[PDB]
Structure formats: structure tokens, C-alpha cells
Amino acid sequence: PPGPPGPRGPPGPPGPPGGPGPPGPP
Amino acid sequence: PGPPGPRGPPGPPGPPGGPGPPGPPG
């Protein structure tokens, strides 16, 4: 029969950097 | 011996990215 199911793949790579912060105070 | 087992599932989503750059001057 078929062998045991394989291991789960690796976690994906880190997401991209976030957007820019809000503008500073007036 | 039988054929190789079914392939494992895909990994989970990666970790979130880092924070974005500093915002613009007020």
C-alpha cells in the first residue's frame, strides 16, 4: 500500500514591511 | 514495498512583516 502521508511544508517567508507611519503632529 | 505516500500539506502562512518606515514630517 501507499506509504504514510508526508510532513507538512515549511512556514512561508516573512511578509513584506508595513506601510509608512502617520504624519507627525503639526 | 508500495509507492511513496501522499505529499504533505502546504506550510502555514509566514510570519507578518516588520513595521513600515517612519511617517512624513508634520
Place this chain on the structure above:
Amino acid sequence: PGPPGPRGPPGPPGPPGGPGPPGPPG
């Protein structure tokens, strides 16, 4: 029984990071 299946593929890229730090004062 056959050999265990191959490891799954890498997961999706992680989510985008958070917002950056607030910008400097006007």
C-alpha cells in the same frame, strides 16, 4: 507499505507588517 510521502511545499508569504512609527513634528 511504501516510503512516507514527500514534504509539502512552503506556505504563503506572511501578511504585510504594521504601520511605521509616526513622523517628526512640523
